[PDB]
Amino acid sequence: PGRLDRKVEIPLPNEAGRLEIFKIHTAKVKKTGEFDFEAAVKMSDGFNGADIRNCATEAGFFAIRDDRDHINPDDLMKAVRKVAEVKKLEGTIEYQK
Amino acid sequence: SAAGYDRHITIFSPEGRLYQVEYAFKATNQTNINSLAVRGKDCTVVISQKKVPDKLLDPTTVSYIFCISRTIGMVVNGPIPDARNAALRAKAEAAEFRYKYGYDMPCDVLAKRMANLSQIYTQRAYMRPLGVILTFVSVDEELGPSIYKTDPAGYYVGYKATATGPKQQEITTNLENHFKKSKIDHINEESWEKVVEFAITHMIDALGTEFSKNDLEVGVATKDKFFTLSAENIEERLVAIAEQ
Amino acid sequence: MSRDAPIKADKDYSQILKEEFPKIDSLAQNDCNSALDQLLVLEKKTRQASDLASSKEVLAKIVDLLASRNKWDDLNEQLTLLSKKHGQLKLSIQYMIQKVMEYLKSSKSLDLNTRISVIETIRVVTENKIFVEVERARVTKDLVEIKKEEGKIDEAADILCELQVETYGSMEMSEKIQFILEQMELSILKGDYSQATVLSRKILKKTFKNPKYESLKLEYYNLLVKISLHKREYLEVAQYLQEIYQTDAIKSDEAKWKPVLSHIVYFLVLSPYGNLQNDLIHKIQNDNNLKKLESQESLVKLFTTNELMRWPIVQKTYEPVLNEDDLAFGGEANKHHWEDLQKRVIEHNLRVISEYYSRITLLRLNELLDLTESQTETYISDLVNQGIIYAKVNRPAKIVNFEKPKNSSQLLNEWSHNVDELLEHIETIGHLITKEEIMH
Amino acid sequence: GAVIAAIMQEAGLRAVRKNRYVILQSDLEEAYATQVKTDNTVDKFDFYK
Amino acid sequence: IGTGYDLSNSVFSPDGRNFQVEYAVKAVENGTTSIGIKCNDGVVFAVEKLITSKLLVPQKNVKIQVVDRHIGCVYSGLIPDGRHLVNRGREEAASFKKLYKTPIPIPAFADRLGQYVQAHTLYNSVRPFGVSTIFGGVDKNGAHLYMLEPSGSYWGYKGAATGKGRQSAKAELEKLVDHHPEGLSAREAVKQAAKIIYLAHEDNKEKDFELEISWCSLSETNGLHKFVKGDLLQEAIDFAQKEIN
Amino acid sequence: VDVLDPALLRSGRLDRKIEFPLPSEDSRAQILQIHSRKMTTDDDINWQELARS
Amino acid sequence: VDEKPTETYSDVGGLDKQIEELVEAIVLPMKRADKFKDMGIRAPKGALMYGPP
């Protein structure tokens, strides 16, 4: 105290906080309109906004590999599974406050 | 930090802390399950999550609730190697006691000796802590409904109700609300079926996650017998709640 | 859900019993429990989307009775019990409750029925947090309108202000701003002026500088004067009314600006000196919309300019004119703002009298403020303390020496400047003699 | 004296929030709870007691 | 990493785990495709045994070993280490037969094996095992298949797979549940094992393989373990050959 | 990997982090071959057998 | 600048994962540059390659 007025503990992005991060990122891209984030965010448990960022970029790389300029629900699903894998492989799931 | 310390269990830090032991309180969340044990007035219920994440496994064999002896159940949270290994000691000490003293071993005495044995494993440095939380449930032949939770260090304390696993904090909060609000230390039903139903409800509340009979496994210690409910037996219970 | 099986299954059941709707209402009149039990079974099934359709049928049945108080009590108990089960998400049970409130608001069967309903509805939506909360403010305020009439207008206002001092995100910008303005009006009726200052400052001033919120902007600064005026702050009011004066709506139409200006004059004058007075009142003077009224020009100018004048002459001029104008001088409490007007002209006299007159008899001064010696001496003192004048008053009625006394140095300084500046004038003069003769 | 300094800072911050101009005894109690730390040595520890 | 944790196998890291046991698993990755296919009237084991050069003798080395006369086992990872766990299983099995006068239950075997692996993580004058072991058979209560990780974890399995090409292997097993919801007969689950191992040899493609298949089935081997050989095995070869091409 | 500056460790300055391991068993045999096609080859050489060594 | 006629990956053995990953990383965004710009997502600004020399 008195260095200081509020100690802000910022946890992992919320269960419906990640949903808002998906809204910001999915806005940027050209898409047909997607409504499958409901399942996506559930797949995306324990993730940080950096990994959600990556998921948009990845989801769009698959669209560009398939030769469409549109993010469809099929490709969002791929991004979240594959990131979840490669996140815990090169991670140790570090414990900190 | 680290300078020896954590590589051993006979090395204390400046603080007197034995670090390696603390790592097993982090090693028991490694199964990702969560447990709930609650008390009624003629039973103790203990419920853990059932993860069958690949359909390449048989959903039957999956469980972490083990029958230790007639009157004693136990839930294991944390690793499968250490689950079996702790069950071996528990099964064995329960049988030996039965025959040494001629009479059954209470929830508390099984809880007490498992911890001491663990303590000796921390005293010596050819052994290591078994990184599991074990929660023994029995309805006592002299003290009725009981829950003793044994922690990997080898602390033991009884409980009214308890939760374990990573997502423990939310379950702690729920259960605090419940007994505080009643001003009695137990669930009030005298039908063990609705207590299992009630345990289920609490569990869904605390976690936020609705369940299925593929995502629960339930142990029930009643006075003088123990049984683990099968999947279709659980199922019956869920359809009482959903439409009361 | 995320999966596809509840999305189809429940919608199917729903459609089959939504053609059974005319049977359901025929059943409801026979036996309320029988018809209800069909839809109770139907809304205890998964999937939010079908339930939406399914709760209109429950709604319909309450309308047919028109409305039965007993049913209403039953409906609200049931909604609260259903949410606990899960409510098929506790993010969706709130849409169902939302309909109960809609009906009440737009249809009032009896006085007595509408009164009884609000108590039930407000109690459910405490644990809900969405559009229910928006609707909450209106169902309470309907009961404020009932309880303006009862002796409980104070109590009724108090409940609603407690609700609305908690911002809500389910509330849109226009709604929040309009709703708060109502809550201020109610604190005045309560008799508590502190509570009104707080609510005023809850909403921000820079939110009313958008053109869409101009409807609201006029209501807010008009209210805000009333609160102030009572507290007898005359400076703040004049500055509030000026904001209205600048408003486009008021200015454009050649009769909307008229009383707004009249009002600004009365409070600028009623304000008790201060340098805020001088700048504000100098702005109204430069305007030629003070040359569109002949009453108002004379009053502001008479208070601004340095004039020696007495009370009854001024009193006489303004006695029939400003008494048919309320929210100025006409009201019963504003008989103490006509009473203030006397002090105000003699507060200005003291400023006049001090500059021009260094030493003047106390006796002569008494007749000028048109009071006894006792009263005058007190009122000289108030302004020597607030630093407006420096004066010395003798009780014997020798003198009153209106001055700030110089010191030995100030006199010596002032006599150097006279002699210095003199020398300059002599030297420039000789320059100009040479020029004038040469060109001639 | 630093905890006390923060207590008064936090109380009249809640006043700026409520858009008041007084600090009340409620504001003190809110402060009284918080910027105190601890309450985390019971979380998994009880084998050092 | 260092500082214990990977230098000793009873010392725990802040991560609540031991990185040497991950390394035990990595040696399994390096080992070759072995499957076990659970069935409703038997159990089938298949293994890929690679041919290093053609000086090797045909069908004379395996990884299929028997315990009793009704429990088949096959291990993948480190070969001589994997032999010794089965050997230790025999000594254990023998003790059960002495005391209780009866063959071992397959869930009884699964418990005793998992105690032996778990012990090699409690001491530091010992090394862990670095093998998985698919095993099981038929007993009283029918057919049971289990698979043991070098982790000392086990669970019942409708399909078990290990070794390098196990990604392909697990997917083909799950297809096998879907196509036949009884998991198919043990006779045709032998053929099914041959098609799996050949696809698994697309991961091991640089050398040649030898397919050894064994079974133990309720009435197709009459409750006993035998090697699948001769016209049965020739069939498997032929079905498998047909179906890759 | 722990000399990487924090400037580039922020998103949108690197996005792909691509690992090169030390050539595994199957990889050694191929590298050896190309080196061997600068000089005479013979039937004597078996790269698989050199790679084990 | 020091550009040569292509070395070819027939004269580089092993490292199959890197050769795939490298094609996805560079070559496909370069052909497909319209598409990355049009969506308005970044392609990887840089890629980092790492491990032994």
Ligand SMILES: Nc1ncnc2c1ncn2[C@@H]1O[C@H](COP(=O)(O)OP(=O)(O)O)[C@@H](O)[C@H]1O
């Ligand atoms: N995959 C390979 N095949 C053949 N020779 C290789 C291989 N990788 C490297 N070498 C040899 O080693 C040399 C130096 O490696 P270089 O590409 O400079 O490495 P880095 O940039 O990773 O430090 C090459 O010029 C080549 O002669």
